[PDB]
Paper text:
In addition to transcripts encoding an FP clearly homologous to A. victoria green fluorescent protein (avGFP), as we expected, the A. cf. australis transcriptome also contains several transcripts encoding other, much more divergent avGFP homologs. Characterization of the recombinant proteins revealed that these avGFP homologs include a green-emitting FP that appears to be the brightest FP discovered to date, 2 long-wavelength-absorbing CPs, and a reversibly photochromic FP. We have identified several new Aequorea FPs with the potential to further diversify the landscape of fluorescent probes and biosensors.
Every Aequorea CP displays a broad absorbance spectrum that lacks the well-defined sharp peak and short-wavelength shoulder typical of most FPs and CPs, suggesting that these proteins contain an unusual chromophore and/or chromophore environment. X-ray crystallography analysis of AausFP2 revealed a conserved dimer interface geometry containing many conserved residues between AausFP1 and AausFP2. We suspect that despite AausFP2’s behavior in gel filtration experiments, the native oligomeric state of AausFP2 may be a dimer. The amino acid residues making up the dimer interface in the AausFP2 crystal structure are also largely conserved across the other Aequorea CPs, suggesting that if this is the native oligomeric state of AausFP2, then they are all likely to be dimers. The X-ray crystal structure of AausFP2 further revealed a chemically novel chromophore in which the side chain of a neighboring cysteine is covalently linked to the methylene bridge of a twisted GFP-like chromophore. This amino acid, Cys62, is conserved in all Aequorea CPs. The C62S mutant of AausFP2 appears yellow and has a major absorbance peak characteristic of a GFP-type chromophore, strongly suggesting that this conserved cysteine is necessary for formation of the red-shifted chromophore. Quantum mechanical calculations indicate that both the presence of a sulfur atom and a twisted chromophore are required to produce long-wavelength absorbance. Because of its broad absorbance reaching into the far-red and near-infrared regions of the spectrum, its relatively high extinction coefficient, and its efficient folding at 37°C, AausFP2 or its derivatives could ultimately prove very useful as photoacoustic tomography probes for deep tissue imaging.
Author numbering:
A (entry chain A), B (entry chain A): 7 to 64, 68 to 232
The structure:
């Protein structure tokens, strides 16, 4: 299903320190090259927080997997998987995020419930002081202890506009939505790249995201 | 000072859940290739915990740095730097670690105070149920907020013998020991590899470690 560009559609309902907002993204992902491009629009007016804080919540199924690592994400399709994260910001609040990642009508949908609490008034998140202009991130992927799904961990070192860097710590799980046979990997990493940009022509609150995604047998490739 | 193999000497005084032990390592590191080899011996009898839990505490100065990233570690030599870590194990205790990394008499010394508390009796650390046979780790390196030193973060996904994987979360700082001019980088990563082995000939409690260390401009290389 993932040999070639396919539509990538995102629906995020957000609730951060009791500020409710909706985001819709349309673009494309290519699971054989590990590339995607998508434009996110806030449909309820303006995001009450850093766009950058939304980006990883808004499709690791598009990751370019080598043939020697089990690709859990593609193995669950078309029914797909649940992707859940706790994201903890150094000196700031916490996001609780639940995603349904499914293949429907020839398209990959990321449907996201994005909740945040404890965020600080003069913090980088509510202050919108974060930047992902061009940034590499390494994500740890492995089988959960029961061998029914995935767990993972990673940091993002967000650029802080007029500051230094802000670490957000992510804990993730992925569990299949269906009862079909799934493929469980051992420990590996994703080398991921984000570039975020704004259309100066566009008048609505939005952000354009390009990602690169590659699964890496770091146990071999780091030697 | 780091163009070619030079002696690498480690002295670790350890205190884990009130169990005191000493480790001495001798080997070599090569800062131009980013390789090192060292054999660690417990001099007080036996390590009262997983060797694997000691390995990253027991010389990022040996990291192969490209010319487009500031190499803080080599910029501090010969006086060298302090390297401090809090290491937190999922469902287990915490290590507090202070290192002095100095160049003395043509050799690179890592002098380590390794403290651990809250470790669980039937846990993977005191139970010695961890393995680093062949494992890749990605370390985040960046300038601290004051621009006087480094901060960093990383996970190690330890193999658990007869289990799955155990995440240890590391927070690190590096601060110069001297008053000399130091070179402060922006965010990048190290792709590091560990291979641990035992000499079946050797009769003392020991472990042999080979590391690969490369500094990576992930903001470019992950695209």
């Amino acid at each position: 299903l993932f040999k070639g560009k396919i539509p990538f559609v995102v629906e995020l309902e957000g609730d951060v320190n009791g500020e409710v907002f909706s985001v819709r993204g349309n673009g494309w992902g290519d699971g054989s090259t590990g590339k995607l491009e998508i434009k996110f629009v806030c449909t309820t007016g303006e995001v009450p927080l850093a766009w950058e804080s939304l980006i990883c919540s808004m499709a690791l199924v598009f990751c370019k997997y080598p043939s020697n690592i089990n690709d859990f994400f593609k193995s669950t399709m078309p029914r797909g998987y649940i992707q859940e994260r706790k994201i903890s910001y150094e000196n700031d609040g916490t996001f609780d995020v639940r995603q349904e990642v499914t293949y429907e009508n020839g398209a990959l949908y990321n449907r996201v419930k994005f909740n945040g609490s404890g965020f600080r008034k003069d913090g980088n998140v509510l202050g919108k002081k974060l930047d992902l202009t061009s940034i590499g991130t390494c994500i740890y992927i492995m089988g959960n202890d029961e061998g029914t799904g995935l767990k993972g961990v990673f940091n993002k070192a967000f650029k802080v506009i007029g500051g230094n860097r802000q670490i957000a710590s992510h804990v993730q799980t992925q569990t299949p939505i269906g009862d079909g046979l799934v493929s469980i990997p051992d420990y590996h990493v994703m080398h991921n790249h984000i570039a975020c940009s704004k259309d100066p022509s566009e008048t609505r609150d939005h952000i354009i995201v390009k990602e690169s995604l590659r699964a890496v047998d770091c146990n071999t490739e780091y030697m």
